[PDB]
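pipeline/complex-builder :: batch 7 item 3
reading input block
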Amino acid sequence: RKAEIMESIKRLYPGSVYGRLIDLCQPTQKKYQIAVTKVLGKNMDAIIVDSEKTGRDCIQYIKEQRGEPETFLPLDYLEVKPTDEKLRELKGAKLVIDVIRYEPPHIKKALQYACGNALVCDNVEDARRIAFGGHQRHKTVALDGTLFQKSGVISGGASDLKAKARRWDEKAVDKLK
Amino acid sequence: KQQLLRAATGKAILNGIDSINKVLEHFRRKGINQHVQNGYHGIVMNNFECEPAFYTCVEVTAGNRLFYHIVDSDEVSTKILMEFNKMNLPGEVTFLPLNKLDVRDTAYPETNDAIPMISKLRYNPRFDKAFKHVFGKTLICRSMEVSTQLARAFTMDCITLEGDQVSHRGALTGGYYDTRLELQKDVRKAE
C-alpha cells in the first residue's frame, strides 16, 4: 500500500534507513505495552534515518511517488536532552525508556526523543499525584494508557490503547518470520 | 451535507466523538455531574476561524490536536474518562483543561521571512491557553530552507504554506498533500 514505498527508501539508500520505531525496540514486559504504546503514539511509525540529508531525500522521493507524509528522525541532527536519572528514585513509578529495549545502541537518541523523562505508574490516582503534585510537573502515564502531561493535557481511551498495543505482539511473531 | 466532513475524519477519530458524546448525554439523562456539561466547550476545530490560505499549514501543524476538547478543568476532564473507560468505549479523547493549562512564554524572532501562526487565528479569548498550546510555538516560514535555519537557530517549529515541516528538535515531516477545515467551513455555512 504505502509500506511498499517504505522498503523503497530502505532499498534506494541501503545502509542509511533503519526503519520505523516499532522495528527497533520493544516494551520489556507485556505489562508496559499499553503505557509504552501511549507514550510513543505517532513516533512508532517515525522512520529513523542516519542523516538529515537522507531524511530530506526520502521526503523528496515520497513527494514524487505522490505518497502519504512521513516523519524522519535523523540521528545526525536530532537534538535531544539527557535523561534526568535522578527520577529513577521516584518512589512509585519508573522512567518509560527503562522499560523499552532497543537495538542498535546508537539509535539511543531516537528514544530519548520519543520518551524523554516520561513516567509510568500503576493506577490513575498515582500518575496524577506525582505529575501535578510536585513543584515541577512530570509527564506521567498509567498502565491503562491515561496520560497526564506537563502542559496540563489529559488523555485516554483504554480500549483503543489495548487494540493498538497488539502491534507489539504481531511484531514478535515476525522474529520467527 | 454534514456527512461530507465525517468521511474526511476516519472511524478512528469519530468513535472518540460518538463515545465522548454518549457519556455526555448519560450524565444528562441521569441528571448527575453538572459541572461537567457546564464546562465542556467543544473540540479545537469548532472554536476558531482562519483564512483559507492557511488551511493546509494550520491543519497539518495540529493534525488531530484538532479534536482536543476544550473543558473547564482537570476534574471535568477526569470524570468523562472514568465513565468513558467504565463503559468500555472506543477511545480516544484528549482534554485541554482551562484550569490546568501551562504554556511557555515565547517571544518570536523579529524575522521578516516568518510569521507567528497564532496571530492568524480568530478565537474566543476565554480559550487562549488552549490555542497557545496547540499553535503557540510554530512559525509559518517563507521556504522549506528558511524553516531549517529558523528551526535550528531558535526553539520554534516551522512549516511552509504547503505543509513541509521541520521541528525545533530536528524532526522532518513531508509528503504529498491532497485536498478538514475546508469542509468544516462549508458546513458552518448552512447553519
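note: Chain A has one domain: 1-177.
queue -> next item
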